[PDB]
């Protein structure tokens, strides 16, 4: 009384996420927590700015202002200090840990060291670990070594590494920064959007790219940036200020989600924003 | 231009999951992937039976019959063999790995060893590891050592361990089995439902309890068992046969969800089942 | 003067080998050395018999009789002893190492221990490690632990493990043995061909299956066995005696290749054998 | 009924690859994947340039432009980033991993660190690891330490190390750079071809030498360079730009193969190129 359905051979289901078709199950799994398998994109809520800036505007009280935003985000990005202290585990949301630091706004910005062991990243159930790369800055060499070290460590354990291109911001520059990081082994790259040439940054990069929100803009303009980035091949956005510094954070997020996952237009989305 | 809201002191949000209020963030995080933070319960789809039974009825073709069920489950339970081979990572669903084995239906059932290293559990992004405890069986001592070893290893890494009471099935017996496992350190206990006294099993166990589906029953009766268990304090169910051996697996799951998360009645639920 | 071809998005190339679509690059790479990416099959030349049998017939002088066969094989299977001593490295052919032993024909056949460290497997540039599983035998439990240990070790390093079902030989039996091994984590399973029901063994096994040659048969019959096995879904054969005990080894191998990779018929192939 | 052929004593088959006749089996095995045992030479397709140069011309889209070349190459050389992301494991071609980096075209070129752990090299099934040595540059000391560290690590595991002489380019200079690297332990040395004295570079180096393609040349001239190098004792070439920057990459590769493995002349080969 058994049915082995032998008339129908077993076939493998392809894993389509850009440049991640040759990774182990666990690593693909963590990546799938970050990039929605359906759309292949992500809306990432970033609040790690304090790691070298202290209580930056809008992030004075993560526990009050940012707490109510978690549920509306695909993934959270922050440090292990904040994570443990004020992000409730019950939030049940994927996290990407800031794993670099030891710099401040009072000194050389590019002077970063690895800020948490892979050991602890695993203890904290991370989906990924993130560090800055500073191409063209004084501590460029060290910043790349930080990426090398996180990748070496993450491959033992199936933890993805996200390289962030920290900074003249033109296409030829970001092409250089993103490609090197990818080349070194980072599975996710986060960079800035550029007025012209962005398409080339995406095309030249073998792995998923995510754009930073950047300094505060009018909500409508912020949404235009997102639409452009997505339309030109970005795999999602990593917003911080353009959300938590808005008068209507939750509304802004829903708009951003509309644009990223559902191919909404900048205008349509802005009207989704005006209804909240 | 900053607002520290100093008139409103920061307060810790309590973690209410039974007997898990004193664990590290990462472990609480993994637990919150299993047990819905809202309802505090879980509907677990179990298909690990093959680990000592080979191609058991209904599990001949996981890739065909079980594949379409994944999305309707809170968490998946299976071996690392099946996980890698036929469970697509894009399933984006929390997993609990069977971590014991080395036994078969052709020999002593209680003769189990640890079947995967914590190393590989982490590599596979697990939410927990599971192993059998056989109180009263020939290899009782070894089975408990399996639990001891998984907890020792899990605590370094923030991985919860689930102890399963494998087997006369009365209340006094399962009280003994579940309590000992909890006492050794397992964070989740999975046991069988009992006609009378089940409430005492839950009350005597300091951590969350989950019931096994058990042998195939008429759908209506299986739902009654769930309702009873939940009503008497279980934290969810770990169904296998009563789902994948049904003529309407997806329908049955929706029913079981209704009973577990939404306090549906056995009858009402059964009518949810008859509509699909 | 650069062309990023931004009109043409990058797409992942699927890895189609049965149940190996969720493995890291290096492991998929080693598997691709074994299973021809085009056909998805393998012809494996096995000469490890001496590991518990001593100088078995046909394998008295590997250096003389077997040496001239290597080039005609897809992959070699043998022990590290023979590998180092008489297989010339310049053979440039992928190897699968026998990694179990400590038994002999003078004692209990199922009493095997792991016979080489993963350390040394990596040192020898192996494509996989192989060990016996003895379901139903006296040392069944230990044999399965051997597989558990090799998988744990292999996963750290991207080395595949092949589980071999050592032994009444019917379908229900081999279904049990193969499925349990796969379930524990082995990426390759090698078993015996069966008169009836073989299709069910393949269908119930989530990873590639390879058949043993078995005791010497008339060349025409051996080819019929291969044809049946392949036709019913096997991923290749692991011949030993039916090749090296033939009066025309090289001829026989070319036949077997014809059947496995090129869908030749038993008869057509036998005529390929009669021309050499 | 056994034949031990005792009238014919067993004899060791010599391993002839220059200066590798005293290595363990595994290491000789990996070297044999790189240097064809028959000819003793190799045609190596190099596309690692991006590791410090970003999207260099011709390598904007490895996945499109370089993908179709793989099959026509003896061995692939690239970074672990590119390997995992866009080189399909099914390519079934030996790889040599770029294992240095942390420099860029925006800073001191000779400032390289080890870019991937031997751990991960083994995980990726490499045939060798490669790093730059910069004799005469500012970070000369560190670059040599990079070779020392890779050799120490490779010897535990049977992984060969390839030292690359990065840079006035005359014979006395490259003799110094190549000889030092070899002396430290590197089993493969890759250097540049020189108008006069190249023969002395080869003679003075105890292990196999491979030449870099160098900047783009007219196809006919590039082939002349290969012919000279081979004729004067090189063990193969590591082309990049002279292939992927050609209007007929595949044709060019076939030509190069002709010259390296089959002792074709520059002219004859060029006519092989004009027919494709
Ligand atoms: O902290 C940073 C890196 O050092 C980034 O500026 C930040 O994480 C990006 O998010 P946003 O610009 O949208 O606030
Ligand atoms: O495999 C088992 C333990 O050895 C269990 O029987 C199983 O996992 C429980 O699920 P169900 O009884 O609902 O099928
Ligand atoms: O050695 C063995 C396992 O203990 C097998 O019998 C052998 O390797 C299979 O090959 P063949 O039966 O074709 O000779
Ligand atoms: O990348 C390099 C070293 O830093 C080399 O220039 C390169 O790998 C050699 O190949 P080619 O000169 O033929 O392009």
Numbering used by the authors:
A (entry chain J), B (entry chain B), C (entry chain C), D (entry chain I): 10 to 176, 181 to 289
From the paper:
To begin addressing this question, we have determined the crystal structure of LsrF, alone and in complex with the P-AI-2 analogues ribose-5-phosphate and ribulose-5-phosphate. The LsrF oligmer has a disk-like structure, with two rings of five monomers stacked on top of each other giving rise to a decamer with D5 symmetry.
In both structures, the ligand electron density allowed definitive placement of the phosphate group and illustrated the general path of the carbon chain, but was of insufficient quality for unambiguous placement of all ligand atoms. As an independent confirmation of placement of the phosphate, the LigandFit module of PHENIX was used as an automated means for placing the ligands. The automated procedure positioned the phosphates in the same location as was modeled manually. R5P and 5RP bind LsrF in the same location, near the entrance to the (αβ)8-barrel with the phosphate group oriented towards the coils following β7 and β8. The phosphate is located near the positively charged side chain of Arg254 and is positioned to form hydrogen bonds with the side chain of His58, the side chain and main chain of Arg254, and the main chain of three glycine residues: 226, 227, and 253 (in all cases with N or NH groups). The ligand then extends across the center of the (αβ)8-barrel, away from strands 7 and 8, in a largely polar environment. In particular, Lys203 is adjacent to the ligand; this residue has potential significance for the mechanism, as equivalently positioned lysines are responsible for Schiff base formation in other aldolases (below). The P-AI-2 analogues ribose-5-phosphate and ribulose-5-phosphate bind to LsrF in the same general position that other aldolases bind phosphorylated substrates (e.g. E. coli DERA and FBPA, T. tenax FBPA and M. jannaschii ADH synthase), suggesting that the canonical aldolase active site is conserved in LsrF.
